[PDB]
Design a protein around this nucleic acid. Sequence first.
RNA 1: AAAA
RNA 2: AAAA
Lengths: 432, 433, 432, 433
Amino acid sequence: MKLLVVSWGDFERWKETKYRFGGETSVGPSTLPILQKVIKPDWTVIVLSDTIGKDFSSVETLREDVRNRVMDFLDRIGAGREVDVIIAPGIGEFTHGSFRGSAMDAYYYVLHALSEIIPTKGDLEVHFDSTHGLNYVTLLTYRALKDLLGIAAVMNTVTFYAYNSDPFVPKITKELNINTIETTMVKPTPLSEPLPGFDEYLCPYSMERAEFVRLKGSLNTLKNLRKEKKKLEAWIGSLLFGLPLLFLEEFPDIGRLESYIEELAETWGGAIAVNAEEKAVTRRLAFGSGFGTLVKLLFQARITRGLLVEEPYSIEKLYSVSDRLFRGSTLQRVRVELGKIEDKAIKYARKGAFPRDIPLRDFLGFDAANREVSPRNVLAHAGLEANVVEVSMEAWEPKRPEEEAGRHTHLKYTPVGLKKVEDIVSRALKES
Amino acid sequence: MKLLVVSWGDFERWKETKYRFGGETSVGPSTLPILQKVIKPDWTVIVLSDTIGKDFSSVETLREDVRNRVMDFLDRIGAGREVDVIIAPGIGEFTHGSFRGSAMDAYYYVLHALSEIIPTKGDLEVHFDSTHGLNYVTLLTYRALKDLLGIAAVMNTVTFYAYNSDPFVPKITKELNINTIETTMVKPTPLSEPLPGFDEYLCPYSMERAEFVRLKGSLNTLKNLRKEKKKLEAWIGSLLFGLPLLFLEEFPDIGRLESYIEELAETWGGAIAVNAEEKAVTRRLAFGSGFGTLVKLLFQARITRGLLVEEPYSIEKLYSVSDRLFRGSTLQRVRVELGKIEDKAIKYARKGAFPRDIPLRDFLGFDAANREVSPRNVLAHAGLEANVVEVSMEAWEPKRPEEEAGRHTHLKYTPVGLKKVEDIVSRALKESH
Amino acid sequence: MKLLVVSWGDFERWKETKYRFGGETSVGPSTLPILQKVIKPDWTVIVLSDTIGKDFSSVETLREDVRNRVMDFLDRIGAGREVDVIIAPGIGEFTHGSFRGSAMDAYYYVLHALSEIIPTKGDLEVHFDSTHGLNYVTLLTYRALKDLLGIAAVMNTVTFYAYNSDPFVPKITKELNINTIETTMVKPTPLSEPLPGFDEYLCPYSMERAEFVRLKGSLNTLKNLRKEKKKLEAWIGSLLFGLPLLFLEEFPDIGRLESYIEELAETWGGAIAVNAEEKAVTRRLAFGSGFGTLVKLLFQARITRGLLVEEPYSIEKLYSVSDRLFRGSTLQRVRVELGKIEDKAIKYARKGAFPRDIPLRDFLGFDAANREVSPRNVLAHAGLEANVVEVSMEAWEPKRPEEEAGRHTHLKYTPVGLKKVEDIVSRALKES
Amino acid sequence: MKLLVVSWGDFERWKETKYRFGGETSVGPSTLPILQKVIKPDWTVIVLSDTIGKDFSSVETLREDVRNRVMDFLDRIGAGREVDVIIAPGIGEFTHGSFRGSAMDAYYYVLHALSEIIPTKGDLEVHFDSTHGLNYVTLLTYRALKDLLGIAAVMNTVTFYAYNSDPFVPKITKELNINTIETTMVKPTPLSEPLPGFDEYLCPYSMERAEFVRLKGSLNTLKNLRKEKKKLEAWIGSLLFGLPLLFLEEFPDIGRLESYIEELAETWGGAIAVNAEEKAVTRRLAFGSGFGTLVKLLFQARITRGLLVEEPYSIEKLYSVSDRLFRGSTLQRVRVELGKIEDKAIKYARKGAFPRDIPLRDFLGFDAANREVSPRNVLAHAGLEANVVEVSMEAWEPKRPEEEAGRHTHLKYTPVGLKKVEDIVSRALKESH
RNA sequence: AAAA
RNA sequence: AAAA
């Protein structure tokens, strides 16, 4: 699929001009139609500062004000149906009002909005126009885009293109070129940051330090995370470090993560105080880095949900998951470890032995030394450490064992072992 | 070490105002003086456009014009003179002149300038102002900065803050708060690009086919790089895939890399046509990604040169190299692979034995089943595959061999083994792109 | 997406040989593993005669028995898990049982199974091995394939390869070459056949002619088609005759067709009577031409479902639909008819005129007494006949009307006119 | 006119059994005699494989060997002798002989043979028995039979029946029913392939690269075709796109097509080497797609030759040509386009005017805006584009012009216009394939 | 500093 | 007539 994203400031103040792009031309106030004409995008996203709001009756008339005029202006140069408009929280003192809050709220808001727009199935061709963007909103939208596409690139080929028109000078300008300023094949970057201390999800901007602790206490999300924090970090680490069995057993609940974000998003919006008489907007809650981590964590889950196979987790299903999830030397380490356990399984099968609920140490044949679950041996052996993994071969009549053993040999962690891996992997994500 | 980077438009056009930042308060036309009082940087870096220039009798009269205008403005404001100015090649048609060329030239030019300014030793605390910038110079300066910092973070701690000012309103503005819009523990990202085809170092923006063919053909770079592509790619992959022995053996000649980058940067600069009468700059060559890859490659080599040593490579030295370069599960598999070779060394030492120039397979005592060198085995075993490595224990009277064999056990690739690995790692680096 | 279709008789009776294919070499009793080696198919299909079945307890133990034996034969040569298996209704009097019914049942059964396997999105590379096939099963599978790929080819590029190994002769054969006997780029062939009379969907093979009229009466499919027979034929004609507006207005309800085909495929299979003691299957119903026409009709709907827009239908969309749907002179007729109406809308626009709900004849400016709607003018003017079409120009403040007019000028058929066009097109489909 | 085609393998290995067909019952080894009793065909065709041959002293001894065996088997059984035996080039190593060559040859040889047996005048009811056939000869014969009947269906009604018998089981079988596995109205499909590049008429299977190029260079066909290629594609386009004027002015020389096919056939055959001692056949040449395209191009010419007439072409003639060749919405546009010019010729006639050698643009009443000949306007207006057609009104005393103007208004392409159309239609056929 |  |  093809996606086009553009950073806009104040669109009603631009001038009619002609643009050249991809051996084609167009005449109007915006770059959008000629971009839409060449790229033929399957979807188009517009990111504005909500700073343009004229009527402050309250938050919903502001987001209505802006959307109305974007919809009017989008008719005025035929920008089509297939459009989303991300009306972001910008700040400062202006002609027709005043907005206040954390400057980083836009990053987290644009990140949350794009995480709900960017296709999670299939390949991506992303197009970005920095022409007409506010300097800080363009830079935050650029970062937010690249952060999620980095996570998409794990499962899919992602090519990114960015455009900036030649500078418009109102006196000399005949025609402005749409230059390609960047064209890159996005590199796979799985989420590599742990969930933070419970301060960093929502922070107070200008809300009294006693009122905050009241509302933080009241939230469901934060207390449900206190529980799940370690298992989520265990899953994040599973992609980072090449732990295919931990990836499956720790797969997060997408609908529950959806809930956490919704509650934090509407909580952040429910602390936006609008004074109609001072034409003043104060966003009393600031988004925290942990809101960013959760958005990315959920996005990463959607991208990889296709791999969550039915139990029991066989050697064959684990090869299959690994081939998609891992690259470079990590993939090759995982193929070797599964190789050992498979090659042994094939030995057992030719002797008519089908061990059920047998320790991986006893399955591979280990002398009773060490038996301590080291960070070293968990991370070094694709999380398939011998003191934490139960093995079972569903008994069957073999004709081609070198083929079958992959299907009939299943791995799961022991309940004790899983808590040791969870602790080890969580801890490794924090020394990062 | 703190570094302050500011992205700057047409500075002579900015209005006087007040700035709030870090409990401090400032009056001026620019954010630079207050950022320097608060952040107290060890070096300031101003990045801005060619397109400010107004004298067109040459390129060196266009740059010395802009440099002198910046210096004169730095005095007008309470700004220091511990500053590097990067005059980036911009594009468009202006009232005072015309600049034509590749848009992407700015990125590669700034990437080149920053690569020689950003410290290669010690930790970095990088501060970036995007208040005054041209959206397209700012984005490219941002992109360029982060790309190098990601390489800097392989060896050192790199934290990154960006700042942008409240938007200025011609006569609604009393004071602008300089807001913090980003703070980042920069993650390690070793170079993951292979070196590209020989079309992609310089390209003709506006040059006759035949004339460009003569230039391309005259470059010592595209000649030396044709034979040396494989070895440089093998080294790139050594960091990426966790191969500490290959890291040392393939360690690039920094001199030869400087030569290549200088030559290409000269050729590009020398092809800048400035027409005095009609006031129009044409950059007849454009920088390719090949140039970008080399700038980063050299930077990665500069960043990691503190680890290189002479040809005897001890399992102890491999352990120490490995803990600097590698992280997560890459480091731990390396430690395990070095563990099983060190342990075998300790078994040999107690028996009073010290083999020399012995295939690692015969040292570990493998079957004769498989001698074919697979990508699987090379990458899976931190590049220390039994069929390509030659072990040499240097005889010593043992007494605590558990803590000693490390220093006296030396690893090396056989000449045949090194070519087999070079091909595997180079092909591996091109299939993961 | 690559696709391998192999036609099999009695796999248990083939002898172990070696095969040469694409410089590669392989040993064993079937062409299938070397075929999957060289072609690397994304999916594989196996078409068998169910006349190899042995256990006659009921229908679902024959397909079970057959499926198990196939699944074991694959397990024994290495064919992987990426395999659908079409067990097709054959006939004849065999060693281990007897099978009676319509021989053409095999055609429609395979057509129906292939219509739910062949991708209905993107290009196709199709590989067909005719080596080990029953003679009439291979000839019917080959036809059902080409007939569907012909419809797939309307929207996407479809290359077709056919292979046959050198004849096996059990005494002298060292190695058999796998010869390519056909290599074709499938030409686009829209459904060109009308829906028949209500006799020709299911027919009695061995059902007394009174018990039949009983079941035909109860089928919902036949009672619904009676209404929609003309709407569906109007649509079939729309692709055949180059009528872009009628393609959108008459686009079939896909869920509604899906259900018609399932009622007829479970009715046909409801009337398969096994006699476990006599070991004699009798398929008391036989699929008719009407079933086949519905399968091709549904497949063509799927292949082209991506073009369906939301009303109203602009000139711009009718250009877009047409570029995808139509080729040769038929496209250029459509582009000229949309050209005239667009150029008229430009003239109206430049004068600040924007007529709504106006007859096309009045919009274009026609003399009277030519209100008779003829098959000639409907087909000759891409279904955009002056007395059956209404034009609406949505009012906009023009700037470059040569660009704008395309988006703001919308066409629909009047409710009177649509019926005239439906009648005309349906009739034109029957004279074919 | 009825036609019975049957795919046979080795007919001397068939058992005896009972056959049910058309109410009747028959005893013997072949389904053929009962197929002839019931269907009562005008002509019968037997397609069988080369591989049945046993005498290897020559290639005509091998075909005279095979034919004899067939004729004698047509006596053992109560069959007719009013028959055609297409002896197709088979492939495989057998107990009695070894045959080598392209497997695809048999399609082209059968397509060729059928092109000269299928009647090219009046309707066709075609019957095909796949009971006794080799799986690959049956598919190729079916494909080749459909390919030809599709071109035949342009001009006449073509219904197709295909039969196959209940599977024969050694000792379980008593009576085998002959099942109708297909009954079709063969849809009209005019040739829609352009003539290919000159790689793809004859290719070397087992011919030394040199020996082939001497042969290829000795061929008249390739030389004559390179120069007639475009005008043949123009004609192929005329039927496909509905251009009735172009169809007449580009109607091929059937004699030169007959010529091209025989030279290629006799070359393909004259390069079959047959070694008598080691009983080996090698067809060192292989037929290409281009040979197939010519066999169909000629067949289409034969099928549509009924319509051609001398150089003056009238609007009445163009109506009747169009009525026979074209269908659906293509026919109706041709009628509407011929309707315009005719309706205008009647306005001219009532005034007593009869223009000669006048451009269609000046005849209809056009501006000077666009004289440029577009693919769009050529294909959309049935090839009767305004800047390439010249109308001549043959002066007559009108008395009911609305019935007469048809016979007395003639259309011709201008020398410059015809080349502009040939180019357009030729290239249009190449983009659509 | 909401196309330097 | 279940790789003539």
